[PDB]
Every structure is written in structure tokens, then in C-alpha cells.
């Protein structure tokens, strides 16, 4: 509910650069084309958290998000991938 | 197709759908230029093929939650009518 | 000069749907991804005019542009393809 | 790289260039998410490789007209410094 609104906001607004600009994710109405479609990947929380934290390939590692924000966007993505809002 | 049903189908394809079909798909009639999904002017699906994709989802396309059945029938008819013109 | 401003405006604003939404063309700062990069294709005036007039593949045929507007966007594209503004 | 030269390189990559490099290219440092051209965080070009592309154009990438040589050197240094971080 509220932990979802948070991840959504990180995915769309707080992240730098924003996840939504690089990634596709229907729940967020995000259609970024730079990296993989997250509705296709359907990653678990750990996989997201690791990717955001360390970076991977040409994806940059996080600098501005706190650890709890990284967890919240990891939880969010892993829960909503493949599905639309509510 | 009567002008009011076409107007209905356009509104669903462009705005009512969640996410909006036009966010992901191209369809010249609606001036939709989505890229993530297939170009519907290329696909030229029939009404049943559209109805099934929207109702059930397909691959990374999400299943509909917001539209009613009548609204799904409406957009299916719309897309199958105008795709490729 | 003025015949170029015209083609540019047709390419960006007057066309329905707009050429710029489907096509990439540097002079217009257009980065549409639906059809081919026109800076890559570098078509002659005839090839553009025919495509706009008749449509081709999933590209729709024109309905709203007058014949002189079709000529102007054909002239424009064929002159500027591969190059940036002035 | 001093903060003012980085600020210069960002401004050129994002706004001064014509068209804007960020319109076509991805570069995380600039929050650029262009798709038409290659991802520069993947390419990780050196300064000479950037200078040559911008000066001469390459494939469907147009040659620079607007930037001065100093401005081309600046953006080349910028991209080669930050590409991949
Ligand atoms: C471009 C400037 C991006 C930013 C902003 C975000 N992501 Fe990303 N991501 C991007 C690329 C090019 C890749 C592919 C990496 C590779 O070379 O394989 C990714 C990858 C991911 C993944 C999958 C990682 C894996 O284990 O395979 C995930 C789950 C992911 N990215 C999520 C994600 C999040 C939550 C972002 C906001 C903090 C984010 N990405 C931003 C490109 C870019
Ligand atoms: C991104 C979040 C999408 C939205 C929103 C809509 N569609 Fe979609 N669609 C999308 C993808 C990635 C695909 C490919 C599916 C696959 O893996 O093959 C599709 C596909 C379709 C199709 C073709 C289905 C088939 O039988 O092959 C149709 C007819 C279609 N989509 C229609 C459609 C409608 C009506 C939408 C709004 C209700 C809509 N799509 C939204 C991506 C996305
Ligand atoms: C999508 C909704 C588009 C609109 C709007 C415009 N174009 Fe297009 N164009 C599009 C596609 C998908 C294609 C490929 C056709 C194929 O199947 O091969 C094209 C093609 C062209 C071409 C090349 C034609 C050829 O001879 O190979 C040109 C020169 C071209 N289009 C120009 C053009 C102009 C001027 C437009 C505005 C009036 C325009 N296109 C709009 C997709 C779409
Ligand atoms: C679209 C109109 C572009 C703009 C604006 C810029 N670039 Fe670009 N770039 C573009 C394409 C399609 C390509 C691929 C070229 C090819 O055919 O291989 C490129 C390539 C580059 C490269 C790599 C060059 C190489 O040696 O392979 C670099 C380093 C590069 N571009 C940098 C760059 C800069 C600094 C820009 C602003 C001055 C810029 N590009 C704009 C497309 C477009």
C-alpha cells in the first residue's frame, strides 16, 4: 500500500537518473528503452537491490538513494513487475 | 463503423486504458506512436485477437484491470477496424 | 531558406501523425523510432513524395496535406537528411 | 577534472550542441537517456574518439556546425572522463 507508493515514487522521481527513463514497467506507466523491460525480466527483490546498489554493465551504481529507499524500490519492482496499477 | 463508436474506441485506446495502449503501441488513426509493443498497423489483428490480448495480457503486456468488458469489445472493434489505414 | 522552414514545419507540426514522431531527422531535432532513420536512408525528393502520398507498409498515406505541402516536405527531407540545422 | 570543466562539458552535451547529444545518446552523468545512438556508458570512448565523431560526423550522426573547437575538446574530455560511472 504505502510501501508501494514509496517505491513507485523512487522509480519515477527520486532516482538519478530516474529508473523510468531507462526501464519499462507498466505499473509506473514507464516505457524507458535503454535497459531491459522489467515486466519481462520479473526480477526478485535481491536482484533489483544488487543491481541498483552496485550497478551492472552500463547501468550506473546508486549514489543518492539511502539504503531503505533502495530496499523500497527493490520490493516495489519485484511485486508489481508484469502487472498494471491495482 | 459509426462515428460515436470510433470516438469511443479512440478514447479508450488513448486515455481510458491503464496503461494507455498508445503508451506502448503505434496506431496511425489515433496518432499513437508507442514503441515498446508491436506496431498495430503492421499486425492488423482481428477483434478476437485484440480482445484476448487486452483481457488476458500476453508476454510482458499486462492484463487489463480498469476497462469493463463492453469497453474491451469497443477498443477491439476499433483497433481491428482502423489498423492499417 | 523559406521553402525549408515550410518543410520543417510540415515535418514537425502540420503532418498527421507528425513525421517527427515516427522518424529520426537531425535537422528537425526529430528522434522518432517507428520507421527508418531518414538521416540514414537519405532519400531523394521523389521517394519521399511517393511514400507520403501513397503510404508504404505500415506507414499511412496522407489525407490532410495539400499537394504543394507534400512537395515541400519532400524537398526538405531530401535536402537536409544527414545534416544538422544550418 | 575540475568542477567548472565538468559543468562546461555537461552544458555542451545537454544544451549547447545542435542537435543536443542527449537527444540521441545515453550518458548517466548527464542524466541523458537518448536511444537513437549508442549508449556512451557502454562505448566508453577516449577523448580523440569523441572529438572525431563530433567534428566529422559518423554514419547517420551529423557533423558539428555550432560548437567551436575548444567546445568540442571540452565535451570530448567530459564524455571520456565520465562515461561508465
Ligand atoms: C540508464 C541510465 C539506467 C538507469 C537510470 C537505470 N537502469 Fe537498470 N539497467 C540499465 C541497463 C542498460 C541494464 C542492463 C545491465 C546489463 O548490462 O545486463 C540494467 C539492468 C537492470 C536490472 C537487471 C539487472 C540484472 O541482474 O540483470 C534491473 C533489475 C534494473 N536495472 C533496475 C533498475 C532500477 C530499480 C533503477 C532505478 C534505481 C534502474 N535500473 C535505473 C539501465 C538503467
Ligand atoms: C505496455 C505496458 C503495453 C501496453 C500499455 C499495451 N500493450 Fe499491447 N503489447 C505490448 C507488448 C510488449 C506486446 C507483445 C506481446 C508479446 O509478447 O507477443 C503487445 C501485444 C499486443 C497485441 C498483439 C497480441 C498478440 O496476439 O500477439 C495486441 C492486439 C495489443 N497488444 C493490443 C493492446 C491494447 C488494445 C492495449 C490497450 C488496451 C494495449 N495493447 C496496451 C505492450 C503493451
Ligand atoms: C508512423 C505513424 C509514421 C508516420 C507518421 C510517418 N512515417 Fe514515414 N515510415 C514509417 C514506417 C513504419 C516506414 C517503413 C515502410 C516500410 O514498410 O518499408 C516509413 C517509410 C518512410 C520513408 C521511406 C519509404 C521508402 O521508400 O522506403 C520515408 C522517406 C518516409 N517514411 C517519410 C515520411 C514523411 C515525410 C512523413 C511525414 C509526412 C512520414 N514518413 C510519417 C512510419 C511513419
Ligand atoms: C542524433 C541526431 C545524434 C546526435 C544529436 C549525436 N549523436 Fe553521437 N551518434 C549517433 C549515432 C546514430 C551514432 C552511431 C554512428 C555509427 O554509425 O556508428 C553515434 C555515434 C557517436 C559516438 C561513437 C563514434 C564512433 O567512433 O563509433 C560518439 C563518441 C558520439 N556519437 C558522441 C556524440 C556527441 C559528443 C554528440 C554531441 C556533440 C553526439 N554524439 C550527438 C547519433 C547522434
Residue numbers in the entry:
A (entry chain A), C (entry chain A): 29 to 114
B (entry chain C), D (entry chain C): 27 to 111
Question: Could you pull the original sentences from the published paper?
Answer:
In most cells, the detoxification of sulfite by oxidation to sulfate (Equation 1) is catalyzed by sulfite oxidizing enzymes (SOEs). Here, we have investigated an electron transfer complex involving the periplasmic SorT sulfite dehydrogenase from the α-Proteobacterium Sinorhizobium meliloti, which represents a structurally uncharacterized type of SOE, and its electron acceptor, the c-type cytochrome SorU. In S. meliloti the SorT sulfite dehydrogenase is part of a sulfite detoxification system that is induced in response to the degradation of sulfur containing substrates such as the organosulfonate taurine. Electrons derived from sulfite oxidation are passed on to the SorU cytochrome, and likely then to cytochrome oxidase, as S. meliloti is capable of sulfite respiration.
The structure of the SorU protein, both within the SorT/SorU complex and when crystallized in isolation, is predominantly α-helical with three major α-helices arranged to form a bundle that frames the heme-binding site (C47XXC50H, axial ligands: His 51 and Met 87). Unlike other known cytochromes c that can act as electron acceptors to SOEs, the electrostatic surface of SorU has an overall negative charge. A surface loop on SorU (residues 82–93) moves away from the SorT/SorU complex interface, leading to a reorientation of the heme ligand residue Met 87 so that a different Met 87 rotamer coordinates the iron in the SorU structures within and outside of the complex. Changes in the conformation of axial heme ligands are known to alter the orbital interactions between the iron atom and the ligand, which can change the redox properties of the heme group. Small (ca. 20 × 10 × 10 μ) crystals of SorU were grown in drops containing equal volumes (2 μL) of protein and reservoir solution (1.8 M tri-sodium citrate, pH 5.5, 0.1 M glycine), which were harvested and flash-cooled in liquid nitrogen without additional cryoprotection. The refined SorU model, from the SorT/SorU complex structure, was used as a search model to solve the SorU structure by molecular replacement using PHASER.
